[PDB]
Amino acid sequence: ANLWERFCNWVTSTDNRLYVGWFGVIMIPTLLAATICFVIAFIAAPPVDIDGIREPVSGSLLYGNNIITGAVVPSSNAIGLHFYPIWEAASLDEWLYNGGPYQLIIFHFLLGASCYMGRQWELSYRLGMRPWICVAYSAPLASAFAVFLIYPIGQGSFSDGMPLGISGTFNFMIVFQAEHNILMHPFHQLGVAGVFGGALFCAMHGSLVTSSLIRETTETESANYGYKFGQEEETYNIVAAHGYFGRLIFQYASFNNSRSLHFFLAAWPVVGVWFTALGISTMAFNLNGFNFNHSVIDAKGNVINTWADIINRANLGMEVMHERNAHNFPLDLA
Amino acid sequence: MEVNQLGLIATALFVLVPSVFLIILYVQTESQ
């Protein structure tokens, strides 16, 4: 054992309170940089000219935001997709005005989070586990890539990336509806199905295992004290929960293989969230939601509005008001 | 920013009162 090997063993040690890992050797610095830049910027960054029209948007607390309205504001549209590291600016004052912190944070963050995924694989290998938790995390990771990288690439600017704020996130959702009619896109409908049903099945599983917990405590103590960490036996009667739940609907609508039951819980929301991340990724290239505007017309040819035309009226309200000083020509093509 | 004066006292007690409850309950659990 020499210097390199002692280090290699520390890095991949399964005795560290927090696993490090080769993926962690990248994740730790990139996440730290992003987290420190994000916190300073959120509190103190001065206004950022997000839309490139010399009209700065104040995102930080010290400049009169609160927790809900504050943000790290995306980098200037004048920058488009150009790389804007600190060293490319003439002064930090220039880097701040033009929104450099958003580039630094998102790049370090996306790098950091891709290696988090990798680190989940890595530790599972050292622990003797099956490897695929990192596959589940890939649904939220891709989702984040979609709003922070892909959608900017398709539209040619990080100025149309998702802002790092609570209200900025809403701005981003609203403008998206106007430009892509995302509600009418099947992949986002799959993501709603992803998350409603993931919440639905999460209550169902909690409610059902909780229902069939085996008495092991008295009325005064928490029932939680009837499980002991590491115990070999199960704390609940799955036969009984299948018996409740098979009758609630019918016998075959109900799982009786615990393995089949948990793979279903993993698979449902992960798939759904893959699809909505893909929906954001593809609407990045302007393949938008179904367009049924004026799809119904009468014998003479008058337009017979459906609910889709009513959506489109709201969409148009979003369209004409958003970024109200930034368009000189009549189509908003990116 | 012209914010609410009572907002500070409402926020502070909102944190302080329920937190102290939990702290009282936890420390006397430990000492028995």
Binding site: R17, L61, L62, G230, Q231 | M1, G7, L8, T11, V15
Partner: peptide, 30 residues
């Protein structure tokens, strides 16, 4: 004053992270 309040509460949560991880109840194999 409201800036200070937002940041104080943020900072309290970060300290809570530190203790919840490093001064957790250790899980024991009983």
């Amino acid at each position: 004053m409201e800036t200070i309040t937002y940041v104080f509460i943020f900072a309290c949560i970060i300290a809570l992270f530190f203790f919840a991880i490093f001064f957790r109840e250790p899980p024991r194999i009983t």
